[PDB]
Ligand binder design. Sequence first.
Ligand SMILES: [Mg+2]
Ligand SMILES: [Mg+2]
Lengths: 504, 69, 150, 230
Amino acid sequence: STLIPPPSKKQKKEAQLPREVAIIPKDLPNVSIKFQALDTGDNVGGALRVPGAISEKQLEELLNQLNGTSDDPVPYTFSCTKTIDITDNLYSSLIKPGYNSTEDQITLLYTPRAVFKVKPVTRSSSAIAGHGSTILCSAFAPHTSSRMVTGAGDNTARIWDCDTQTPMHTLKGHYNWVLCVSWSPDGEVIATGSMDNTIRLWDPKSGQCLGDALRGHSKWITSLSWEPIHLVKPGSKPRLASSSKDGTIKIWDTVSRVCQYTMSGHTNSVSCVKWGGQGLLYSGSHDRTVRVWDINSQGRCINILKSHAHWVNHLSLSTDYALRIGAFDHTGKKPSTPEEAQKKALENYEKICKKNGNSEEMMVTASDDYTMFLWNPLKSTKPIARMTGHQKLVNHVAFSPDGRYIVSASFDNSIKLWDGRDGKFISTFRGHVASVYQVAWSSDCRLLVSCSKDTTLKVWDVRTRKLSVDLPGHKDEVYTVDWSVDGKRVCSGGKDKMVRLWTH
Amino acid sequence: VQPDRRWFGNTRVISQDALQHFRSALGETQKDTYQVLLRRNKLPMSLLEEKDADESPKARILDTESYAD
Amino acid sequence: MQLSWKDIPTVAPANDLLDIVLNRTQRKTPTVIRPGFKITRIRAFYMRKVKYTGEGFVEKFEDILKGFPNINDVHPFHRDLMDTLYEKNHYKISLAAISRAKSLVEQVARDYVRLLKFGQSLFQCKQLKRAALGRMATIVKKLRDPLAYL
Amino acid sequence: PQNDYIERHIKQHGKRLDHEERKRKREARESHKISERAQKLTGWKGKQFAKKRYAEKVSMRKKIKAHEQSKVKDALPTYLLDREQKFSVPLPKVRGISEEEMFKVIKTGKSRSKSWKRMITKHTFVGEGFTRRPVKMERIIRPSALRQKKANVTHPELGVTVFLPILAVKKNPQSPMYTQLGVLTKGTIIEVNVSELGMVTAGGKVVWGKYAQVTNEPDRDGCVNAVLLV
RNA sequence: GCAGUCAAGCGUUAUAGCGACAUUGCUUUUUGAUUCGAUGUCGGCUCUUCCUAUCAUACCGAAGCAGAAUUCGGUAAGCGUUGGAUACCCACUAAUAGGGAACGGCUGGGUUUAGACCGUCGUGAGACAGGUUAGUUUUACCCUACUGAU
RNA sequence: UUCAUCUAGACAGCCGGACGGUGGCCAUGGAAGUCGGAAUCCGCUAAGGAGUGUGUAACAACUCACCGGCCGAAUGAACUA
Ligand SMILES: [Mg+2]
Ligand SMILES: [Mg+2]
């Protein structure tokens, strides 16, 4: 093993020299600050003088008082403008290096954050067997972290109990590789799209197949999407969108088990389909285009976005976490009524869509031309921004659960972190030595997990933009990774035919 | 050549901490004109020479459309 | 302006070009060498083979590169017309592939002449010359599609 | 003339009055002509004619087989489909190479009376920081044209070949003296930089150095080929 | 070249083992951008002939070969294939093709013996990793062949 | 040498048929079997491809795959020496 150089004699002597203590002076004068919001840029309180030894929580309490929510505080974070976060106190964060004098005002930008905290995963809880071929896809249940669904190449899906780390149900309806699995956003039905061009629905509590398979695709299923709960009217179930290599997007009513629309604009293989929160579907295909369809207008193509010079491989919406989660939360409470479920899902979707004046739903598209395009298709059809910098194809792209960051996983063994509003480059996560297949966020948007071709998982801390913990243990290439809604478990799977559950 | 299990082992490995150390250090080195290189350390320089670039290379057009098409 | 580009010599496809150049070597350079000669004579024989074949490929590639118009340096009307007719991206990529092949053939010839300076017998010298010509042939075979397009 | 003037000329004027008949008789004479060429061509042209005839017949048989086959009638994820790509060594025993073959006597002096300098006729790896010894005390000569730095390594897993830099010479089977001189002949064990292959140990360490065996004769083909020892 | 893939055959009752043709990876990536150790024999001049593996000249065949010009090919050695400058250039030219009879007569560099200097090594006599300068070998009237002559 | 065809008709030739849904769907300025991409079905048959090539800007016309009429006794294919 190659090692870092040892300290020299001089360095050992300076280490033996007595250390200085970073202390806070007691006569430190008051400093003028101006509060300002990151998303809206509203200056609240004007230039007010605060003690130089002010702490993060005391500053946060002052801000909650000035905004008028002292009874109901929401924890925020503070940044300074080079954007530097306020860690422990203002003196240590800014004054101690001396970048700004005390007499000068400091413009402190406050950003709301998540109330709950997700611990990093540090160890493999278990290595679970049962699949006879390579594992292709995995997802957690949206309401609980105790139920996981995994589809593999032995023509089967599997429902795993994460509590005992033991298999619970085997789903053996299909005739070929189960390419995609998806859980209903109300957590009631599992949809599996296969290599044999079929979509099969399953009851997870009994591990059973609902009727017969949905048919109509002439090529293998590539992606699945669910109708958002907040758009679904109470007393009715969401519809299922499916895409395939034949270039069509088929919409299925599961209540009556029929096909309502078959959108057919694309000319090559459709890579992905995402059902947005404003009654639209976004489809990405190998014909270098992204199509915007309106479900309210009998499945017609509204827009064609053409800015990619090669295949589009993936796309991600800003509200994707909320749309997948539906009415559930990080506490996973089951609503009393479908009415209250619909209202809570609507509020959860609105808290991310409608902000900074008007509701927006940004889309990001990751392509084979080594780039990504950031769009706001509701307002403009030209791209908002172009993100370049990757040396190989961008295989996976993901919006952060609060919609403030974009993470792009490429085949150049790298991940890149971008701003989720205007798409400017922030940082590069390095450490995978082989191509990074896909990535996943935590619920509180501080931790990111990536799986690679190098048979490893990696957990990254976003705020420090550095590697948190490297997780080996898989014997072969890892294809799929996911993080639970409550943030308690991470699942992974690949060529080793073993489902790996990881915990703190 | 005799059969031996030493032929099939790894000869050099490097940890993630060491990779991060050398990746950060390569860039904080300040060359002096009066210092000469007496001996170079042996490192995985392909792993270590990773720089953020503002621009991406152009796409390959022959994948989507061949000369005959 | 040139305004007209009829004076471009015929572009042979990859297999035909290989036949033309390799048979030109076999015809126009002497073919009889004996293991009983001086090693200096044997080495000069095989060096001449490698150098002559490399020059033949280089002259074909140069005749291709000099004849064809420069799409970005012509009048913009002609640039747009040739872009519509021939797809400028494919045009420049094919001509650049020819240029890369020219550089690789020159490098192969130089490397194997330098190696042939240290050959100790007819067998080794012959193997080195065959390796050089085979590498040139591999480079030319990788040009099959751009040559047909051009 | 402009655009497709020969096609327009044929459309407006036709062809020569004997065109179809002459072409038809030439095609009918083709069988006799092919037989005559096969029996009359000599030397290099005859050998090439026979070679091309064999290739054409193979191609026709493959086309017939494909037609009749048509007339009768890894488990990758979604983002990887529609995309394309005992501790015994593979060479336990190799040809013995004597010192007479390995070394060339270099004569020195005005009348060539001294014969103490020796030149290595094979390819070598001299390592990092190589400086030649002064000419008065240089007995062993390793010329710069025969020094190699990189090798074509084939991985048995995934069947890929990569051009990897050479780290060291571990074992030349001919002699430990050739090992310490860095001679690269067939069957030599070398250390290679495997950083671009992305290998990770069970403990999470990144592998960047492994062993390979040389499988060819670089003095004969001008390059180093090795198979990785996994 | 190494490593693989295919499979016409070879093989056989144990889908083992060989294996032509095809084919992929490395070498070697995309926008026509931008000299690295020959250890031991080389060259002129005059003059003849031979090979064809043909550069030109003759006649043919093919090609988006309009014409002009060119490219690739067939028969073909009858006939030519240069002047300079220091293996590359400049030019002229129809063209400035490759090779053998040596490398299994005068002459310049070279084996260059004795003189001499510089460099490296050697305690030294001296030797060389080397560099430079100066340095006599002189048939024919014999036979034959060849050119002419009785 | 081993397979096949054959007087309820061998091979070669000449003549005739070679159809209907239908210009099948997408795509194109145009594209009707015959620039392309995917399906390649059904009917009527003695037989007839959602077509083997020539051809047209697209059609047309010709062709051959297949079937029949005339003719009348052997014929074809792959292997070995
Ligand atoms: Mg000839
Ligand atoms: Mg002397």
